Amino acid sequence: GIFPVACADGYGGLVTTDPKTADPVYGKVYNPPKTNYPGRFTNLLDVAEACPTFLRFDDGKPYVVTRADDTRLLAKFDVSLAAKHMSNTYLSGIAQYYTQYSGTINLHFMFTGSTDSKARYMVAYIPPGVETPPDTPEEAAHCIHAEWDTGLNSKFTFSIPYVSAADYAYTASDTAETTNVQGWVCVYQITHGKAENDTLLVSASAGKDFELRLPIDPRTQ
């Protein structure tokens, strides 16, 4: 009374992604319940919200030179996922192990001069390919721009919408084309009030929308 055998013609590979399980040997041992032990996280995302970052410049010093002079342009830095501006960075550090992604990078700002001093500053987006960096905050305003002064506040956060070609993009970059991927988005300012010295800080963080698809080892393990 044999049951009809159905011998497997050519399947059953010892391949990685399989979810099959196994059998214990010296098994059947309990353990204490590990509820209530603080420090629990489940997603690099949420913990990739509550923390800012610290950018970098050729001065090797995070903070930015901030001169109380008649200059009109502050400084220009790129923003990307693989760029010298954002290497030592928690978002990217998680990222470099990914090829697919969709999410807005976020920012922060911290001030140095005494509260008394008056000031103005103007954030300014730029698309990847305008072929010309704007040379005045009004004609720079065309892309995206905003304001927040010394008045009533010191912290501030701002973002840049996840523009692309299609609803995804490559994390790493190429050696087959030339055009920058995002632009040179940086900030403008109006007449400085007074300072013997100042300083600006900026960061990054994931907010609502940071997304990834995965995985592959890039490294030379």
Partner: protein, 161 residues
């Protein structure tokens, strides 16, 4: 959001260099840039079940922690015999302590507790390890690849012909 739940990322294998007729079973013999150890290091306190896969010859034998190593070959404590070509098992957990960790600052050699164990046979060629249901606690710093040249980065990309 349908990733960063480690329960999906930490269910694969990774290589181990060292081998011996008697060999040790612990995570800290990982590689410190293989993606497994990327997150696997990134926290403070973690915990899982265990699964392993071994290609070998002879008679693979294992024992939980806290034993006399001089008391293994004899008396054939739990074990099964030999069979080619593949072999897959899963070990349960033998805590002397209610959670694992990475490093323990005391007056920098690794402690003697955290020990998934040790295997022994007559010919041991290939090892494979696999985490289970793990959880992570008190995350820690992390780095990316270092930057040397000027602009952003450059990297070759595969394309058809």
């Amino acid at each position: 959001r349908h990733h960063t739940d480690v329960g999906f990322i930490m269910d694969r294998f990774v290589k181990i260099n060292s081998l011996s007729p008697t060999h040790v079973i612990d995570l800290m013999q990982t590689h410190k840039h293989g993606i497994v150890g990327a997150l696997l290091r990134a926290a403070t306190y973690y915990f899982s079940d265990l699964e392993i896969v071994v290609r070998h010859d002879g008679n693979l034998t294992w024992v939980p922690n806290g034993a006399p190593e001089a008391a293994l070959s004899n008396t054939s404590n739990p074990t099964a015999y030999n069979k080619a070509p593949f072999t897959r098992l899963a070990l349960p957990y033998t805590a002397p302590h209610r959670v694992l960790a990475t490093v323990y600052d005391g007056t920098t050699q690794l402690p003697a507790s955290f020990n998934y164990g040790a295997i022994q046979a007559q010919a041991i060629h290939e090892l494979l390890v696999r985490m289970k249901r793990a959880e992570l606690y008190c995350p820690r710093p992390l780095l990316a690849i270092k930057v040397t040249s000027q602009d952003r980065y450059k990297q070759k990309i595969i394309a058809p012909a």
